[PDB]
Symmetry: C4
Subunit: 288 residues, 4 copies
């Protein structure tokens, strides 16, 4: 395990030509090393180290921890690492159920809990769009889905799906008229707060998030739409497409500025330290 420990020390920090040497030395030991994680690309997606990931993409020995590495790259919020994962090992489809951390969360939903717009838009450039809003009532038609599992996974996965479908970001993500759809989802979550018991506080939170979302989009304030359908929906609380897209861009830029006015995350500092160490290893080992 000596070469394994050398590989992991080259893995947590940069050591990029050391990993090139581990490539060129006939791959004597497989990339299956365990510290606390079963595989090693999970600990390779820690810092902003793209070249390690590109060298991992040439290691197609069925290293089947690409999905959890993608979930780490989304939850930490990388961009080009997510692109390197999505492009080269290939993906046929991702619709219902495969056999590959690991919560029961599709990566569009996990990209929707965070509000990082470009990650979800890169997910939308590939074909996977809608998080499937079903009935989620006592009767749904998919009674066999209610009969496969009989546990708290139904209600909690329902709440997680509506947290994904809460539209924190869907105004850049739906096709046409996101405000009316946000009003409809607010009414639906209000009715679920009326009906579905013992979890009503979360539905009230999501309904107030949708309300304050619509209020902020109104507070963009370029040109008064003031459609009477919008007014009647408020009672229950083309060039038009061009005005709508311009307001979409305004709200996206304001949301990104309000993201950039936030408190520091310590992991973002750890990213800077690992980038400094990767610079150290690149410059010194290319001098040698």
């Amino acid at each position: 395990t000596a070469e394994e420990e050398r590989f992991l020390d080259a893995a947590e920090y940069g050591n990029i030509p050391v990993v090139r040497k581990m490539l060129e030395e006939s791959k004597t030991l497989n990339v299956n090393c365990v510290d606390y994680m079963g595989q090693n690309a999970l600990q390779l997606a820690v810092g902003n180290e793209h070249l390690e990931v590109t060298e991992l993409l040439l290691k197609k020995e069925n290293l089947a921890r690409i999905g959890d590495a993608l979930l780490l790259a989304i939850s930490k919020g990388y961009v080009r690492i997510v692109e390197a994962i999505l492009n080269h090992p290939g993906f046929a489809a991702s619709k219902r159920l495969t056999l590959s951390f690991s919560p029961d969360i599709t990566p569009i939903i996990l990209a929707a809990h965070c509000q990082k717009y470009e990650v979800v838009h890169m997910l939308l450039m590939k074909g996977a769009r809608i998080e499937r809003p079903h009935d989620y009532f006592c009767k749904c038609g998919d009674c066999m889905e209610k009969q496969r599992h009989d546990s708290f996974s139904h209600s909690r996965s329902r709440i997680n799906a509506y947290k994904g479908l809460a539209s924190p970001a869907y105004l850049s993500l739906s096709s046409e008229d996101p405000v009316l759809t946000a009003l409809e989802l607010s009414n639906e979550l209000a009715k679920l707060a009326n009906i579905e018991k013992e979890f009503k506080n979360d539905y009230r939170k999501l309904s107030m998030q949708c309300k304050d979302f619509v209020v902020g989009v109104l507070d963009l304030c370029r040109d008064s739409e003031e459609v009477e359908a919008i007014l009647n929906g408020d009672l229950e609380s083309t060039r038009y497409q061009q005005i709508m897209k311009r307001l979409i861009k305004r709200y996206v830029l304001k949301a990104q500025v309000d993201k950039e006015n936030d408190e520091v995350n310590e992991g973002e500092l750890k990213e800077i330290k690992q980038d400094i160490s990767s610079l150290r290893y690149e410059l010194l080992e290319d001098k040698s």
Copy 2:
């Protein structure tokens, strides 16, 4: 769009000799690439990457997004990027109305919402000084300006102009005796709070900002001016020039220290990461 995507990947991060190669390869594809922004210098003014901007200044193919790039460089608060924008592509004048994001905000006003003194002073070294305090009453003389637009843009642009004219920074920016002018503007904003309805809280905020401004300038405390005109203005709440300029310098230095004792912005961390990546690309691609 393959060269376009290579250009944008060279654009978000440093890749400065890659952009030199894109220059030297006959400019096969124009700099008009769209991710969410129409042009590309907007995404080039993200980090502290001056050499990209200087290479853009040699690209005079009527890439008409210099003004919004200047607004980004002011709102994020760069210094030498603003100098590179102001110097080389040339500016005839900027007084009332041209045809070139984009709120209805002149860059002196947007430099005045932020309190960054050196940016506004570099604006004042060129000829554009005053944000035009007009009557802003029911009657103003410029009734045709009130008749061109008939909307909320009058009142809201008025409030934005008085937020620019609130003097957060004008003590380094006016010509002579900024304290008496601040007292006069505080009296004017008090009278506008008395008269102009449904927005009185903002005028009260700006009046209290002017009052606390004058109180802090009094709290500099080198030599007691104590002019009886200042006393009579407080009732309604040369060597003198040398004392005034020295107090101006004292207040500017105290304001800059109080700026440097503020909470961290995450965009300032992103600037550090992009500077690290620019160092990476410079050193590695100059080794090659």
Copy 3:
């Protein structure tokens, strides 16, 4: 002391080939320099400077400040510096009492006040596991330990030992079933709060920490264990091993994310500055 001051200036910052020159110049002056600390590896374990420590490991001239340097590397929370200290100068055992800052704290306890899991796990890979929970009553059997010292060191070292034994991290550190042991320790600390006077607030704090620990481990929520022994312990407030280890890994990852969502420490910024200066000294002095 001129070479001593040059050595200390090479010691606070990087200057790694300068320290190589101080090695190769026959070691004219010993590494015993005093600014405020008696030895110098204490001021060498400030930044993320591993090569200095590896050059110190070849300096085996009985520089007997390895233990306090290990305590600094644990309290600041380095990883590979702790590995470099533990591996090469050798350690026979660490059980009760040796003759080598310096509080009366064994490094497992000081690694247990901080919650850094990998440091304590690297301590557990070597043979030193348990922090010795004794009776700690009026009668204990070790009455001669109560008669060697007669001071406040008994009660305060007892409280420090139970702060080490509070299980902030022991769910990754004990062998089997940490939740039941946490319940037993919560009951023991509750009884010590009932009995041991004038320090009851700290025992109440540790008992509430154990309670909220067990509540969070319950709030992992994969599969309901719901053992009736757990229920009866709550009244006084194999595949099972596989489920338990998976919940252990879930709680460890959630704890590390909650660590990485914390406020910035200024010493972590100082680490970045000293790493930048080490890069400066490496690159410039290897150009020369």
Copy 4:
């Protein structure tokens, strides 16, 4: 002023061989450039750029802004920049009054408002120790000092001197028994709060700071001194030297850790950016 502006652009950022070229090109224009500051070493002591300062020390053309640059290096809290200022241009003495920003604050007092221990200790290694506690009553003996100036400078300079003499750091700085001297100064500031009117809140603050200082030094808790003189002083609220010095070292280390657990200053981030730009300029201009 073209070479002046090139020099200032080399001055705000690193550009160290550019400043070497400005040295070697016969010094055509003197270092007297004005942006807002009269001299230029004030804007050269912004970042952690030592080589610029060492090149300034070879520029002995009576560039008489060394004292304000020293005050900037102390107030921002550099270490080796302060050493470079103190060592090479020479200092005869600094006792009462010379003719060379600029508040009326001696650098020991300005180093005492900040709590940076090593800066004040480097001041104490040179001969300047005591901030001269005089009577500061209605009668003092130095009545001519009260008759030279007749203004608020007496009371405010008195309060600033007692803020310097508040002992935030003097336990590492006085000769022997700092706790009894802190008790005496607390009694003196209490009596000044009884006597000197209209500023009593600041004296109450400094007295409570001295009280909490003594309480924290008591809360070090190695060995109970419990001198009856300390008890009688509390009523009005050798090996002993070795115990006292060890408690001094304990309190200094605890104070430095509590400094390193503080909120981030944005100027510390600006230091990192200017160090990155200095690395950029060094590496690129040494490639050329």
